[PDB]
């Protein structure tokens, strides 16, 4: 059993444009570890398994945290450092194409359906409890845990949005979007450090580190 509130408790308890974006992400990774330890049963896993899930997941877990929090601002992103990055700001830094992907595939669909925080935290716990991640000492423990989240998400969506029967499936069907933009964000960060013209701080660099 993982109650959906404790998941809401976890989301709540932690709260050149590209240089500011990467700085915003570096300090959210410190945040990310403290959130995960708040997800029920996560700290029960083998520690190396905990490591694997976070290194496999961090990329999409951060995208989904700032996408949801940017539903208030229009045509822009609200960074964790309090700064707003408008679309034009990003376009004339040269990251326009992927910045728009986030705007049209995630924040707008988040806004347009009014996805709430509880639902956000469940999707983040689904992304965290990823059973196909290489090298887990027991992917079926993780899998059982992913089954507890999606069960606790369906029951939530129907008790509270009974007039929206397709809502729970609408949530799950943005996860392919989150994975596809997770990967292009990574292609970008490796290209940034290849070029060497973009400062990268020590926790973010470690996540890029092999």
């Amino acid at each position: 059993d993982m109650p959906v509130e404790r998941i809401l408790e976890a989301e709540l308890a932690v709260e050149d444009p590209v240089t500011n974006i990467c700085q915003a992400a570096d300090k959210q990774l410190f945040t990310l570890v403290e959130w995960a330890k708040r997800i029920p049963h996560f700290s029960e896993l083998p520690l190396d398994d905990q490591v694997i899930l976070l290194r496999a997941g961090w990329n999409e877990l951060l995208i989904a945290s700032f996408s949801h929090r940017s539903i208030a601002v229009k045509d822009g992103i609200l960074l964790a450092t309090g700064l707003h990055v408008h679309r034009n700001s990003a376009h004339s830094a040269g990251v326009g194409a992927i910045f728009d992907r986030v705007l049209t595939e995630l924040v707008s669909k988040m806004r347009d359906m009014q996805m709430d925080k509880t639902e956000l935290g469940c999707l983040r716990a689904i992304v965290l409890f990823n059973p196909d991640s290489k090298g887990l000492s027991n992917p079926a423990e993780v899998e059982a845990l992913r089954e507890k989240v999606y069960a606790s998400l369906e029951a939530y969506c129907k008790h509270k949005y009974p007039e929206q029967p397709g809502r729970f499936a609408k949530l799950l069907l943005r996860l392919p979007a989150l994975r596809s933009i997770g990967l292009k964000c990574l292609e970008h960060l490796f290209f940034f450090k290849l070029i060497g013209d973009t400062p990268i701080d020590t926790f973010l660099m470690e996540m890029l580190e092999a």
């Binding site: 990774l29 570890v33 905990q50 976070l54 020590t202 470690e206």
Partner: peptide
């Protein structure tokens, strides 16, 4: 690594 491992 050292950071993520340490924090956990």
């Amino acid at each position: 690594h050292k950071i993520l491992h340490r924090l956990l």
